[PDB]
Design a protein around this ligand. Structure first.
Ligand SMILES: O=CCCCC[C@@H]1SC[C@@H]2NC(=O)N[C@@H]21
Ligand SMILES: O=CCCCC[C@@H]1SC[C@@H]2NC(=O)N[C@@H]21
Lengths: 138, 68, 566, 169, 177, 43
């Protein structure tokens, strides 16, 4: 939950200024943990960017999140290193310095260090031709 | 003051109570026109009319005077 | 007298008279109103969900929406068959197309809600949307109009509500100089209501007219051909600065595959008849040939990029701004709204609403002691100065004069206007008629129509009759319209028309009770059978429908939409 | 090639500020595969672009048989004609007046057998639908092509129209 | 344009409150008249209070005259300021005249400007100079001379005045062709 | 089909189709050409 959230925010204004009609927001992240893809879905209810939920591995809860100063606008290979705070409903609170990149999201805190690989989705986007090419060539 | 049709009713303000904010002092109905007056004159308001009493045009329904 | 400041302090303090301090007390009256509002929004906010993923609602608990039960299995089967083809059956193309973290509007929604009555008496045509979805989208730093043709072809491609939606989108884009993107999937035409949709004016030809008038003004437009566009639908790929044809299922035809039969019926493959022909054919038709949906969407984005509008939008609308919230909680907007179905008009207020919507909860009153009926003054909406006309009571001549004066100033200084509609409220007194009230009403309407200022209106409630001509109306070119649930648009009288038309209709003096049962009850049924939910939006009368709580965000979308204008 | 010639003519007329007159007829878009492969859609777009873009005053009069999307090539109400007039023998309908019958006969829930009853129920019915509309009712009465005239007195009417369109800015 | 009506403006002076985008009438002493209080006498002299003759009439009269009714001088001045605010000229002025600039002073003390000026009441014209004055006034004490050897009488050239380029014509002597 | 990005990644990555990857192998043909060019620029 903290790792997935950092990649969005530490890349753009996802969940920032977002707005729809008579509905609610939704945004998802795919993690390639081990050899099995992992999907995490985040959404909001109310007029609150603050109130956020999560559903990973059929486990649901709520938390709030308060970020820090925005840094590393150039978002280079080092990308963005920012501290995060997360208040989960149960009652806890956490602080996480996340240096996130397209390749992976690294979270360091009292849990330890964990890097989660993001599900790779690249394959000659364009040149994807399965045509037989039987005759009348060159 | 209310227009000609009158028929004041449902007055929700106590006589001799300060009115600085513009609450609905009296509500008069003219062809389903509640048209609340909503006076903002400061000071207590003194009522000279009663609910259900048909009043003439531009009648002195109440005197909104400074609290003395 | 012992008072010598320098205007500020008196200003720039948390105590300026400019602000407003209407604090509610949450009493029964508040509850009665607040509760009802809640009773007026839940389904509004809900039907939206049902038409979204239309006809497939797995919860099966949609009793909060009065929508009839529909065959969910048939719609799921159709969607499965369509998605097996390789194309995404949803609005998914849109949120894939728009940049993440950005906004959206969904201009017209619930379009064609239970519009047509079928041969089956209890069945209506299942047009969950108008057949398309329309909303303002920000692509690659560029604001654009997005029109997507839904894959619902069961009833037929386009209806009198579909072409009207498309033409409204085109007119909005041309007025605002937002480039359009069309997502094209069609079943051809509708050969049943063809007289209603093909000939005459404001029809399918005007789409072709607009796609050329735009390119005259150098407002580039883009179309994506996901499926077949026949029966005059093949001209949009031809009339396009950039067009995209998917490698397998993208097809464009001027004559149908059945049409070659019975007229030199040497039938050949549908590919050779005009579909995506990636073999270096002689035809130079269609700019982009993309192997996959993602590839096509990506090339659309890439073409949108090379338009040079990013600099102009970034300069005109500041991307990095500090949001200033109002002083009072926006959830309280439902409370000040009174209830419904009340014999006599209930009471109402405006100050609270404006204090809840505007920035910093402030206002700039003009003459309020004089013409106490009508309200006009300046404001602030998310960093932009605004003028608001909100109506309260029965209009007088002096109210019309004040309105004309305000509109004069606003046009003079180029300030946008916002309208909050209310009752007609034209007095019928003989002295008022003798006082030249008609001349003053004309004074108001002349200024309203003559104004070159961008104009948006939103229904508060009770907009019935010719009074809207005084403030604003669809026939007065409002660049956007939005509506609240408790809206009634009717004849010059909502309640009085009942009383007046009771007298003058072939009524005997006797049988009074049976007559009032047949007259008054019937006309009440007629004049409140129309409402916000059905007569509006579904017929693209005041196309936008919103919630009262989230009005300021919507109006801020509208104002940012109307500053790319020339 | 007809579309190319039309585009060229409209180009000259707009260049020299010459008014245009239209005499509508059948749609007449060939459906041959070679013609479709020859970029016919591009040339039709070439024609319609010039038609709509022209600032020249434009008037159309129905000769007869104006059915389908072919009018988009020449002119139509949705292309801002400052006047429209009609002759009695006019039919404004779907892309096919007669062929729509044959095509829609095939693809509508028809069993192979009962051929005679089916063509009685299909072909006769669609003929009734597509010639129930006509010059007299579907037009003018609904302000589709509002003007209705006689074929004999056309030049006088067109001369009225042209004198009407020279006070323009 | 904006006008504030603190006292009476009669005798054609009442049109400025009428010809105004915004006008302010003080609650007590603000009065506007087209005919004077003495004027009603001797012509239907049914004299009534000066308030009713056209002064500040805060009773929701039929007249929609005068935009602002302010209870005090400070209130009226404050509303004038508030109306001035909503004109959208702030952006245009801020763009055109930079608000945040670094002042560049001249190289010589401006008190010396009185010295190079000669005396007065002198039978024959006294002597005079210009270079010193321009060097004392301009930024950085600089100048951009055109032809000075030729037509040595008259002085013309460019300069700098607080971040803005200026042209100066200063005259010295008897003019020639 | 198991592919659901948001256009970027597919974009804003060092792997967009927009770029070009013609890498030469410096063979005789290259030398014959490269060398001549050098023979066409010195003077
Ligand atoms: O007694 C004065 C109230 C006059 C209200 C007139 C308005 S005009 C439209 C509407 N229909 C009516 O009969 N009355 C109101
Ligand atoms: O010579 C054979 C070709 C016949 C073309 C018939 C044209 S194609 C478009 C239009 N629609 C019809 O039903 N017929 C005409």
């Amino acid at each position: 939950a903290m790792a997935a959230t950092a990649w969005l925010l530490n890349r753009c204004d996802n969940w920032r200024g977002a707005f729809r009609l008579n509905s609610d927001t939704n945004a998802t992240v795919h993690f390639y943990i081990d050899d099995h893809p992992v999907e995490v879905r985040l959404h909001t209810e109310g007029a609150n960017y603050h109130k956020i939920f999560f559903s990973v591995w059929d486990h649901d809860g709520s938390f709030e999140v308060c970020s820090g100063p925005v840094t590393s606008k150039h978002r280079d290979q080092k990308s963005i290193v920012n501290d995060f705070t997360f208040l989960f409903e149960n009652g806890m609170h956490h602080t996480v310095l996340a240096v996130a990149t397209e390749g992976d999201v690294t979270v360091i805190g009292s849990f330890g260090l964990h890097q989660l690989r993001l599900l790779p989705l690249t394959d000659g986007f364009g040149d994807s031709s399965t045509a037989g090419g039987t005759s009348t060539k060159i | 003051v209310s227009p000609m049709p009158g028929k004041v009713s449902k007055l929700l303000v106590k006589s001799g109570d300060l009115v600085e904010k513009g609450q609905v002092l009296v509500i008069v109905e003219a062809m389903k026109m509640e048209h609340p007056v909503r006076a903002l004159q400061d000071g207590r308001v003194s009522f000279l009319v009663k609910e259900g009493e048909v009043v003439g045009g531009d009648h002195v329904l109440a005197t909104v005077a400074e609290e003395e | 007298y012992a008072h010598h400041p320098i205007d500020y302090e008196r200003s720039t303090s948390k105590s300026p008279n400019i602000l407003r301090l209407p604090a509610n007390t949450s009493d029964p009256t508040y509850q009665e109103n607040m509760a009802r509002m809640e009773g007026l929004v839940e389904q509004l906010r809900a039907r939206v969900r049902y038409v979204q993923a239309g006809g497939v609602v797995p919860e099966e608990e949609a009793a909060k929406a009065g929508v009839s039960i529909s065959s969910i299995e048939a719609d799921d089967r159709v969607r499965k068959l369509h998605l097996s083809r390789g194309k995404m059956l949803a609005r998914d193309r849109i949120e894939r197309l728009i940049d993440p973290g950005t906004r959206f509007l969904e201009l017209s929604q619930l379009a064609g809600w239970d519009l047509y009555w079928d041969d089956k008496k209890k069945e209506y045509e299942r047009c969950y949307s108008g057949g398309i979805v329309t909303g303002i989208g920000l692509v690659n730093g560029v604001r654009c109009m997005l029109v997507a043709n839904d894959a619902t072809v069961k009833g037929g491609t386009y209806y009198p509500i579909t072409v009207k939606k498309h033409l409204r989108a085109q007119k909005i884009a041309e007025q605002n100089h937002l480039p359009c993107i069309y997502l094209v999937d069609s079943g051809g035409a509708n050969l049943s209501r063809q007289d209603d949709v093909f000939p005459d004016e404001q029809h399918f030809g005007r789409i072709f007219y607009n796609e050329a008038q735009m390119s005259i003004k150098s407002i580039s437009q883009i179309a994506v051909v996901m499926g077949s566009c026949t029966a005059g639908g093949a001209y949009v790929p031809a009339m396009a600065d950039e067009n995209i044809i998917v490698a397998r299922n993208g097809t464009i035809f001027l004559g149908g595959p059945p049409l070659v039969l019975a007229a030199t019926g040497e039938k050949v493959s549908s590919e050779e008849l005009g579909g995506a022909d990636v073999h270096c054919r002689i035809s130079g038709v269609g700019d982009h040939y993309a192997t996959d949906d993602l590839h096509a969407l990506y090339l659309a984005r890439r073409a949108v990029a090379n338009l040079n509008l990013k600099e102009h939008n970034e300069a005109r609308n500041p991307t990095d701004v500090k949001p200033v919230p109002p002083l009072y909680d926006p959830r309280e907007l439902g409370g000040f709204i009174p209830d419904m179905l009340s014999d006599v008009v209930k009471s109402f207020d405006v100050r609270a609403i404006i204090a809840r919507i505007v920035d910093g909860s402030r206002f700039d009153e003009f003459k309020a002691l004089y013409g106490n009926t009508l309200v006009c003054g300046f404001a602030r909406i998310e960093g932009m100065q605004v003028g608001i006309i909100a109506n309260q009571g029965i209009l007088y001549s002096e109210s019309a004069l004040k309105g004309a004066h305000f509109i004069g100033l606003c046009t003079q200084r180029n300030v946008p206007l916002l309208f909050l509609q209310n009752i007609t409220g034209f007095m019928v007194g003989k002295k008022y008629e003798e006082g030249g009230i008609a001349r003053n009403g004309a004074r108001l309407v002349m200024a309203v129509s003559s104004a070159p200022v961008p104009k948006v209106t939103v229904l508060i409630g009770g907009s019935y009759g010719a009074g809207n001509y005084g403030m604003c109306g669809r026939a007065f070119e409002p660049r956007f319209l939005f509506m609240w649930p408790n809206a009634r648009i009717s004849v010059m009288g909502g309640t009085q028309a009942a009383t007046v038309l009771t007298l003058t209709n072939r009524n005997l003096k006797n049988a009074s009770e049976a007559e009032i049962a047949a007259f008054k009850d019937k006309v009440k049924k007629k004049y409140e059978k129309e409402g916000s939910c059905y007569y509006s939006t579904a017929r693209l009368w005041d196309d936008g429908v919103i919630a009262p709580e989230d009005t300021r965000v919507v109006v801020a979308e509208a104002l940012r939409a109307t500053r790319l204008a020339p």
